[PDB]
């Protein structure tokens, strides 16, 4: 009777994968989005006699960390990072986080925020002079010139905190901001040091890395698997319906 | 879970949402209209 559950599980987890895939495709135009990878893992039931039952469960082993195609928008605050680089922004709960969205905005009082998260430099969050033109160098050096001031006063202000961390060492949080894993936190400390070897380009925005071929193939496979599991379910139900007649004396 | 093998866990997303639509305040080109009442701002400024 329980074979109608095994297949059911697969069908249900199929829907889960579909959700993940949709969550990727809804973010096809999101700047600095890292598509979540999905993977079914098989769990066998440990018990007496043959283990003729092995269920599935979906999981998301992190994200896909191949940098996307760059968007050339003529805005000096827009930045694109070298592969495996992260900007450090203060998250909601007063803690550090890593993001790839380089669309930096200037607040009314001069605070640099990415998606409302105040960017953190070498000395903490950055305070920009009131209403000034910002130019970011290839290493993160920030130069401010109150537009209209002597152009030889292009005074530097600070430097962004750019962090090197591969995709294996980082896990996503529920707010969409990436953080270090527990093992990586133990092996590389809590707060990562800024790597001066990371190059940052100003005037270009990085897009998402949602590969449409993979999404289409995943949808086709998910649909076929769902149809197979529903069929197994129908067969099992019909068999049990026929078998219930054995109790009539 | 507790850790050669792939990590476990399943963090499903929720979707997309537009947060802010921005205007690029870069100086545009100048078009010549001989009338004496049109002027063009050379830099960062707005008429009140």
């Amino acid at each position: 009777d329980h074979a109608i559950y095994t297949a059911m599980g697969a069908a249900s987890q199929t829907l889960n994968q579909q959700a993940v895939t949709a969550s990727n495709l809804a973010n096809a135009s999101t700047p600095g989005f890292r598509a979540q990878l999905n993977a079914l893992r098989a769990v066998p039931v440990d018990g007496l006699s043959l283990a003729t039952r092995t269920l599935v469960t979906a999981s998301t082993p992190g994200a896909d960390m191949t940098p996307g195609q760059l968007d050339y928008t003529s805005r000096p605050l827009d930045v694109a990072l070298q592969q495996d680089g992260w900007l450090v922004v203060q998250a909601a709960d007063g803690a550090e986080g890593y993001t790839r969205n380089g669309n930096i905005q200037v607040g009314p009082t001069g605070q640099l925020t990415i998606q409302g998260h105040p960017v953190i430099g070498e000395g903490g969050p950055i305070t920009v002079p009131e209403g000034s033109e910002i130019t970011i160098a290839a290493d993160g050096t920030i130069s401010a010139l109150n537009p209209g001031d002597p152009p030889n006063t292009v005074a530097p202000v600070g430097r962004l905190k750019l962090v090197k961390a591969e995709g294996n060492e980082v896990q996503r949080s529920d707010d969409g901001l990436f953080r270090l894993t527990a093992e990586a936190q133990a092996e590389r400390g809590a707060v990562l040091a800024a790597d001066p070897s990371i190059r940052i380009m100003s005037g270009v925005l990085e897009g998402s890395n949602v590969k449409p071929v993979e999404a289409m193939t995943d949808m086709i496979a998910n649909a076929r698997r769902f149809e197979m599991q529903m069929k197994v379910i129908t067969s099992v139900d019909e068999n049990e319906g026929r078998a219930n007649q054995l109790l009539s004396m | 879970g507790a850790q050669t093998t792939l990590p476990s866990g399943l963090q499903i997303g929720t979707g997309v949402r537009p947060v802010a639509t921005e205007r690029l305040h870069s100086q545009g080109n100048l078009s010549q209209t001989n009338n004496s009442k049109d002027v063009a701002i050379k830099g960062q400024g707005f008429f009140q």
Partner: peptide, 21 residues
């Protein structure tokens, strides 16, 4: 021994972990 026999001992609990402990 054979599936469907009679024994005086309850079967051990059926645990199926997701990750190796």
């Amino acid at each position: 021994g054979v599936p469907g026999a009679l024994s005086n001992q309850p079967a051990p609990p059926n645990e199926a972990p997701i990750a190796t402990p």
